[PDB]
Amino acid sequence: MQRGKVKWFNNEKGYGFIEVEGGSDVFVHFTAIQGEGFKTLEEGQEVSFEIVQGNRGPQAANVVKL
Amino acid sequence: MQRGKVKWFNNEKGYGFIEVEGGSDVFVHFTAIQGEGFKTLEEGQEVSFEIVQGNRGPQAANVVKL
Numbered sequence A, B: 001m002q003r004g005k006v007k008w009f010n011n012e013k014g015y016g017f018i019e020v021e022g023g024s025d026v027f028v029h030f031t032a033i034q035g036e037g038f039k040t041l042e043e044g045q046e047v048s049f050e051i052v053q054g055n056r057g058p059q060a061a062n063v064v065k066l
């Protein structure tokens, strides 16, 4: 588990990337976003998350807005 | 998606396992469950999901109640 900030998120498409200090960007799909409310992220938002490997490569899991 | 059936799920602990045909049971955490509902599953529940590899091995992502 670790923290990062949303790099960008296309609200219409429901995905974007988390930027990591000193690391590679991490793909994030809306289905990973925790909490209640419309599943979205905004550029700059700090998040905690886990990295998992799926068929398309690394992606975020358990994305909590801080 | 992959299909399976919930073997058990403990809604106090927030986890359980999904049984899948021809393979090992897959760990499922409440944070993977989709829907604005309460994030719980019940024994026997048919689901669609994705298997991803996390730091503890295979686990469920994107768990949708069918």
Ligand code: NA
Residues within 6 Å of the ligand: A019, A020, A021, A022, A023, A024, A025
């Ligand atoms: Na970076």
Ligand code: NA
Residues within 6 Å of the ligand: B019, B020, B021, B022, B023, B024, B025
């Ligand atoms: Na099995």
